[PDB]
Design a protein around this ligand. Structure first.
Ligand SMILES: [Ca+2]
Ligand SMILES: [Ca+2]
Ligand SMILES: [Ca+2]
Ligand SMILES: [Ca+2]
Lengths: 306, 306, 306, 306
């Protein structure tokens, strides 16, 4: 079985991404990073999630409580005040581990050398800081699956997607490190990570433990997505990314390009792609261009059905 | 008949755009700006074009020989050394007018108040500088049709399109002046402004004065486009824009959005679009999202067969 | 007698600079630009000053009501709401000319070719725009004296001085056009263009038409300076610049350097100087490094007394 | 005795600063960071230095071999290709420690809680990365003495000083962390850290083991300073900073201000100081404005004359 770490800013769809990761892979741990909502709450949400889903022995490690330069805002309008659509859930009794996420990533990369894969469904701060501490980590990590970036439809600024915007320095460091990277950008999630009202009716009538979990945590994500898309639905970028890592045929089309990240001015966080290979930098990532949404929906439905 | 000025950095497709404008509209003048190739050469290309096509009475006005900040390069690799695919064409008799483009635009905006339309198929320098000279011009201009910008597929930098990149300051000034603007971006021209090998075979067989002009002036544009697209053909952004101006049904989909232009850093020239309307500036341009390439092709074919 | 135009964002010390210029030089005109206070108020201040000081036949030309990119704010906290320390002065009957400042600058550059000097005591918008309209103006202007920039002690941002901050694009354009340029920076004004409490004691006892004008127009500038310097007095950058132009021996030390202006990020407006000549752009301006404050004070007191 | 770590990009004057530190303080360790010359050569220089000056037991820890963003260049023209003015010095026995500088800084911050001072005479990368790993380190570090920044006379770009230019991100991080910081900027070193021809004559005549080391290691620094300053001499910013830390009376004037670092554009690495307290961030550093060069020269001479 393939071995993963999920690096998460735990709220809403990140929780479903962990759920899915715990079924498809040997989940060696969940590392926490600043992003979506208050960090302590993110940590609470991850521990509760792993407990609820019967994976109490997956360790949670605390990582950076800020991006490298400390410039971001939380998005409670998308995820709820608690990152769980204000579902007042029962306090978990699971606790985090002592080891820092940076130390854990570096350790797990030695123990599982050549096999470790990272599902990076958050700002890239922990991975960038691990790499700066020990650059030989690139020898040992098999693959990184990154949710982030946008071609043009920034969801946070006009141009920038949330993860890259929170920590563009981290994104830049990770992209030029020399990892094997596939990137799942926002536009691909918007189309292929989408659920419509009938998909919601169907999940809602499942009345399983995991289906009620899904409805409960993602209520605010659906409200927000419905507002911005102008049709009832929700968008699930981290679940899609985890599904693609597992089943690579969910990728219908992709390209190997040189991907850069703007650090400055109004365009801070922008994903800059040398589409025409005119600028003499070597390709550093596979960018997903089209994905199979039906196939994601069925993996998701199946996991909530169990 | 509708009344237009064409503002052009005259090379390759610009000349066909001028041809089309002169058939579809009352062409009140061609204003010349820095961009594609050496300025004095652009002037010659426009004077030659206007004589060759039987429009020798249309005046040519010299505008700015640099963008506002003077930061650009010419792109002889696309247009040829002379902006006409190295066709050594005969020197025309026609000379430019003495009146500066800026003074001509403002003067014509009063003579033709409420009717003057601008076909902006070049860096926006002359339009910006006329506005800074007399901001009341906004009240007298009916419409500006702009070829510029990219969503993601920058043709000059990884993110920036040529016209926007050459004079980003000018583009920002024009976009925020208060004109009624429609923008035709690079991705739309790449799809719906394109001609394939069978189209080129047809055009060469027409064997008219105009069809031979088209083949001669555009050879290098075909070579350049063929290399960068990986399939034989040529892309005609300025001709497509003029065609859209003429027949608005060529617009299949568009959206009124707030468009901003990055002035700084690696992303200078980038077209920033508030797609989800999250950022509190009201929309300022109709962005064309999909065009009818077949309808454009027929307009071009008709024009060249005269 | 040397021939000058004063380009002014007319508030407080600008009016004293206009006074001195009219006594020291043949004052061919005053051009108005956006900057210190509301533009229409600046015009009224310039009209009033010229009438009050017996120079009613010096023409006032309206230039740009915004800097090139339109990004600034007025500083009523320094100059009073009306740019005259809230002196509700009587309406003058002098009117401005019809001719735009850009057109007047270019015309006067031809009528006074090789002699015309510009006293640039404001953001540099009008001069930059005249240059972009007709770059041959650099063959016709004898000299530009610029009040602008700071080494480190930004008076508007941490690093940027007001004039350069308001229109950094214009500053960059003017510095690279090829004029003969001397710059009086903020730190030199702060030291050598300052008046102390004993100086104000003296001026307020003179009881002349001009001394009463000085006291009335500069009251708020003294309040502001005293708050920001921690000791009673005022700073007179424009009057010092006009005085240096007149009597060059007031320059005690200066250097010919390559000077650049930052357009981007937190440092927007910063004056960048290649002090060690390490960067391969040839020098473009004389930077004043030390001035004779005593000689300035004596010139001011003499003028105010006569 | 006061206890210090020296954080150094070891070449030329860093070696003398290490020497001074070893005499004035309990020197707990030298940490190495990328900057001045090739990183592996810097490690060799620190090892040789400590061995040669009789401090074999001072541990050397390898830190980051790049700034956070990996954007810099070495300056072999100032320090020589080996960072020791091409002195082919004999290879020492001493080898570095295994522990990473980041870990050692954090460890020594606990071991010497409330007493540890850092002599930060290089780009600030190791300190920033230690802080991001464990933000509580601020509670435990007593003081940081930073050599870095320029008011206007950038020695690397027109505005930026080398250390701040190499890692502006790290500088920003360190400045806002909440440490007790005194900064010694370039202009202060240039005046008060300077040695003239007579000082060099005196030092060569000392003919001690230490005086020969100084003359040998700093030859290229003298050659570079002499061409760029136009007077025979050398500049010793790191040795001045260590001297100031030791004898605080060497500070003749200083100011408590809010200090910022530019990360973008032509001004990247610029030190931005809120001189007038206009911008509502609380002060974060003591900035040295004038130093006692006479006192500095005697500490140096005493160090060399033994
Ligand atoms: Ca996430
Ligand atoms: Ca064009
Ligand atoms: Ca002024
Ligand atoms: Ca150093």
């Amino acid at each position: 079985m393939r071995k993963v770490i999920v690096d998460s800013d735990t709220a809403t769809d990140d929780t479903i991404a962990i759920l899915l990761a715990s079924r498809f892979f040997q989940l060696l741990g969940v590392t926490i990073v600043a992003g979506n909502v208050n960090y302590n709450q993110e940590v609470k949400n991850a521990l509760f999630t792993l407990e609820y889903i019967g994976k109490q022995d997956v360790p949670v490690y605390l990582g950076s409580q800020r991006p490298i330069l400390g410039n971001w805002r939380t998005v409670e309008e998308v995820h709820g005040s608690n990152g769980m659509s204000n579902w007042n859930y029962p306090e978990p009794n699971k606790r985090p581990e002592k080891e820092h996420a940076i130390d854990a990533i570096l350790r797990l990369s030695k123990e599982h050398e050549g096999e470790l894969e990272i599902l990076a469904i958050s700002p890239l701060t922990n991975i960038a800081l691990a790499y700066l501490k020990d650059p030989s980590v690139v020898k040992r990590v098999k693959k990184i699956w990154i949710m982030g970036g946008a071609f043009s439809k920034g969801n946070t600024t006009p141009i920038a997607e949330f993860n890259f915007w929170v920590d563009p320095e981290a994104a830049k460091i990770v992209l030029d490190a020399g990892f094997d990277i596939t990137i799942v950008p926002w536009e691909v999630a918007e189309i292929s990570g989408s659920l419509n009202e009938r998909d919601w009716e169907y999940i809602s009538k499942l009345n399983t433990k995991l289906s009620n979990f899904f409805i409960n945590v993602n209520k605010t994500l659906k409200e927000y997505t419905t507002k911005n898309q102008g049709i009832s639905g929700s968008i699930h970028p981290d679940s899609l990314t985890v599904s693609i890592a597992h089943d690579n045929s969910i990728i219908l089309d992709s390209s190997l390009k040189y991907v850069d990240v703007e650090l400055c001015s109004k365009s801070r966080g922008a994903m800059l792609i040398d589409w025409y290979s005119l600028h003499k930098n070597k390709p550093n990532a596979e960018i997903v261009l089209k994905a199979d949404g039906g196939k994601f929906k069925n993996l998701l439905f199946n996991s909530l059905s169990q």
